[PDB]
Amino acid sequence: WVIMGPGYNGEIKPGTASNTWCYPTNPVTGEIPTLSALDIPDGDEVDVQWRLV
Amino acid sequence: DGYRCGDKTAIKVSNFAYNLDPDSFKHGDVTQSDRQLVKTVVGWAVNDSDTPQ
């Protein structure tokens, strides 16, 4: 099979070319990495808000 | 031929009726029906031997 571009209305047809699409066959980090941690010191609720901000 | 050729737009019509009264209308030739009586009255007017009109 060969993928055709915009000029062919995006259709995909049988046949062969020389521009082969391939894929590394390896699992990847499909998520946001380890959320280490954040140490905020104790204080009044709004005081805490300030430190975050 | 063409991108998405086929299943092209179409025309549709709905709510298609309206008993409009635009005021101007015509009066054709008319005909008269048979005459008939409604309430009627009869009577007498009478005076006397010496009662000038």
Resolution (angstroms) equals 4.5
Q: How many CB pairs below 8 A link A and B?
A: 4
Alpha helices in chain B (DSSP H): none
- Spatial separation of the C-alpha atoms in residues A17 and A3, rounded to whole Å: 9
| Residue of chain A whose Cα is closest to the Cα of B5 | A9
User: What is the Cα–Cα distance from A2 to A19, expressed in whole angstroms?
Assistant: 9
- What experiment produced this structure? cryo-EM
**A12, β-bridge pairs:** A3
Report chain A residues touching chain B, CB-CB < 8 A: 9-10
- Chain A residue numbers with beta carbons less than 8 Å from the beta carbon of B3 are 9-10
CB within 8 A of B49, min separation 6: which ones?
none
Q: Which residues of B touch A10 (CB under 8 A)?
A: 3
CA distance A9 to chain B (A): 5
Chain breaks in chain A (C to N over 2.5 A) after: none
Measured distance CA(A12)–CA(A21) in Å, rounded: 13
The residues on B that touch A, with CB distances below 8 Å, are 2-4
Is residue A28 classed exposed, middle or buried when 0-12, 13-18 and 19+ CB atoms within 10 A define those classes? exposed
